[PDB]
Copies of this chain bind each other. A is one copy, B any other.
Amino acid sequence: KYVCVRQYDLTDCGAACLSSIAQYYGLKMSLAKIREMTGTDTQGTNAYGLIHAAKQLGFSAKGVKASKEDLLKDFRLPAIANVIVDNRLAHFVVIYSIKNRIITVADPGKGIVRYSMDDFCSIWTGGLVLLEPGEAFQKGDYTQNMMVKFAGFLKPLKKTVLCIFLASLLYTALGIAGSFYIKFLFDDLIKFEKLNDLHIISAGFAVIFLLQIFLNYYRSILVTKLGMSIDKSIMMEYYSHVLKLPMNFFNSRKVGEIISRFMDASKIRQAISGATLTIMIDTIMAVIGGILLYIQNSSLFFISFIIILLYGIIVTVFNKPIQNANRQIMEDNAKLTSALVESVKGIETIKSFGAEEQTEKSTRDKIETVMKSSFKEGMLYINLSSLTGIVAGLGGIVILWAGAYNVIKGNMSGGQLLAFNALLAYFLTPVKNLIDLQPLIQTAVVASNRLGEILELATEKELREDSDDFVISLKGDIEFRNVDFRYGLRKPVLKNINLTIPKGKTVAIVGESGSGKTTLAKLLMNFYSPEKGDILINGHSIKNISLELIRKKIAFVSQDVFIFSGTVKENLCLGNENVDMDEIIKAAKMANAHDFIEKLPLKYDTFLNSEGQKQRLAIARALLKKPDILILDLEDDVTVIIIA
């Protein structure tokens, strides 16, 4: 079926290709699991990670080189090709069918595309990964329907939904009733010259409109409140789960990558509320409108049905090219913004080298590309609007023509045609909304999957299957035995360490221009678990001790100091909740910080927020922790591991 899995982020390209191949063989899995399983870092994945992850799925993976001649031969059909686009990135494609003249490749960023053989070999660098379902392969479906999971938020908000439904029904009924004002005017009042009845009936048809307006007001208020509640629920759940995820999740992804899902929550809410309400209301309203239209005249109703069918056909045809054009515009805008940012940041180098003429030329070229993509999307929109306007206006003229023909023949009256034209709104608009619901549903399904893949992950506490046991004291001799570490699937950083740290006697490890020693301290904070070996405090293993106690009794003063926008009092008391003024005073006095307090605008520095007043706050906080183990990047302090 030539499965092509989209890539949610700019990095999970090899993971998307592996997921596509797995789904091609009857194994569907969440993209998050494969992403954390291929060793996807900020830079991206590689052939080794994909091969290892395929081995974890029972696939038989190999890493081979190939050329045009090797393509001319016969090998496994759905392989992975390391195609380089934009001359960088870890971009991958899935080669499905050889078809010597034209190579058909599934790209996670564009879809199923077809390249010329020469063009393909120009863009393909020879890196081929051959996947084949091995003996251990097992078909299955290991993903959850996230649309149902997010629609479960509507269960507590049932009374609001019911009230919205009832208000919509009343609004529709009042509008349908009031659409007959023109018929009553032209068939009874004007024809027979009734003046008192004209005033009485017209006044009664204005109260209906006022009730309709009030119902719309109430329903709009309810819908706004429902949407805000759903947005808050989704955002808070996502953030609460994210805050508990392991450090691998944070090290493997950027900040915007984690943050854009807050915006995707808005799309999920848009689906769950708008699509559901629109379907529920508009189905009934369109059915009633169509019944009434057929009541007035069968031929005019059939013409209206043809009009709405043509509109739906045109919209469905134009749906996907618009999405492709919008994606291309977004990519071009991102490229232009990135170029502008790098140009502004390095303005000094441009000035020194006199490269202002070529910089503006490159910016002009990128702006020209952006304008070309914008014109393509604008022309698509113009064509769609022209076609739909032709259909709508010509159908209206044809409806008036056929209604006049029927009135002349005597099958209708002067007011029945105008009543039909009035009810045309309540028939055509619901079906138009039902047809237009497609892009919203598709985009929000994508966003719901994007949030649910993360929401399926396991937090730090869940991974620690072993309990706390009975370790409450963290005072002892630290022992690293046969400890090996790996940052995902990269080269090992720490190999066969046998290290002993006494109880109190301050030590300081000495490295060789390497940051790996720093992550040694990260192995004491349980941020990562060693691949092999053990870490023990006295005679008790680190994995044996509770996570909360380990992070509470160990203080790490990282060289990357984190200061958030808050008062100095709040910045110092982070996660304590049990402190007195004297303790903070003593801690600041110890770490040369109480002196700087008096030198400021002097609102006890509780306003907000050189690299000497940021770190010193970190050591002050570390002493506030009262840690059993202190690490810097009383005798019973279990040494002070200083990173030197």
Where the two chains meet, the residues of A that have a C-beta atom closer than 8 Å to any C-beta of B are 84, 86-89, 125, 181-182, 185-186, 189-190, 193-195, 198-199, 202, 205-206, 209-210, 212-213, 216-217, 220-221, 224-225, 228, 231-232, 235-236, 239-240, 243-244, 247, 250, 255, 258-259, 262, 337-356, 358-360, 363-364, 367-368, 371, 374-375, 378-379, 382, 385-386, 389-390, 393-394, 397-398, 400-401, 404-405, 407-408, 414, 418, 460, 525, 527, 548, 551-552, 554-556, 558, 560-562, 564-565, 567, 574-577, 601, 604-609, 621, 625
Contact = CB atoms under 8 A, between A and B. Distances in A.
Contact of A255 (B255, B345, B358): B345
A561 to B, nearest CB: 8
A393 B360 contact: no
A368 B341 CA distance: 33
Contacts of A577: 358
12 contacts: A87-B605, A89-B607, A224-B379, A225-B375, A232-B368, A232-B371, A247-B348, A339-B564, A348-B560, A348-B562, A351-B527, A354-B551
A363 B514 CA distance: 34
Contacts of A86: 606-607
A575 B213 CA distance: 66
A217 B386 CA distance: 7
Given A216-B386, A375-B228, A389-B213, A562 B346 contact: yes
Nearest to A224: B378
B405 A195 contact: yes
Chain A interface, DSSP helix/strand/loop, else mixed: helix
Residue of A244, A407, A460 with most partner-chain B CB within 10 A: A407
A387 to B, nearest CB: 9
Nearest to A522: B348
A255 B344 contact: yes
Q: Ordered nearest first, which 8 A-B pairs have the shortest CB separation? A: A346-B562, A353-B575, A88-B607, A349-B562, A355-B575, A87-B606, A202-B401, A354-B575
A520 to B, nearest CB: 15
Copies in the complex: 2
A587 to B, nearest CB: 14
B356 A243 contact: yes
B87 A382 contact: no
B88 A527 contact: no
Given A244-B356, A340-B258, A87 B604 contact: yes
A235 B556 contact: no
Nearest to A401: B202
B352 A88 contact: no
Contacts of A363: 236, 239
Given A209-B397, A575-B354, A609-B88, A344 B250 contact: yes
A354 B551 CA distance: 7
Given A84-B601, A353-B551, A358-B574, 7 more contacts: A88-B607, A213-B389, A250-B344, A250-B348, A255-B345, A348-B562, A351-B460
A386 B215 CA distance: 10
Contacts of A393: 209, 212-213
A575 B193 CA distance: 87
Nearest to A242: B344
Contact of A525 (B247, B343, B352, B356): B352
A347 B262 CA distance: 17
Contacts of A567: 87
A525 B351 CA distance: 9
Contacts of A401: 198-199, 202
Nearest to A205: B397
Contacts of A606: 86-88
B394 A209 contact: yes
Contact of A353 (B205, B225, B367, B625): B625
A320 to B, nearest CB: 21
A221 B382 CA distance: 8
A407 B340 contact: no
Contacts of A604: 87
A247 B351 CA distance: 9
A625 B352 CA distance: 10
Contacts of A225: 375
A18 B375 CA distance: 44
Nearest to A359: B243
A414 B378 CA distance: 42
A198 B405 contact: yes
Contacts of A202: 397, 400-401, 404
Nearest to A396: B209
A380 to B, nearest CB: 11
A346 B618 CA distance: 12
A339 B386 contact: no
Nearest to A189: B404
Contacts of A565: 87, 338-339, 342
A402 to B, nearest CB: 9
B404 A198 contact: yes
A107 B398 CA distance: 60
Contacts of A552: 354
A404 B88 contact: no
Contacts of A209: 393-394, 397
Contacts of A386: 213, 216-217, 220
A224 B343 CA distance: 29
Contacts of A352: 525, 551, 554-556
A169 to B, nearest CB: 19
A613 to B, nearest CB: 15
A558 B259 contact: no
B213 A390 contact: yes
Contacts of A193: 408
B408 A344 contact: no
Nearest to A413: B190
Nearest to A335: B565
A527 to B, nearest CB: 7
A228 B371 contact: yes
Contacts of A350: 243, 562, 574-575
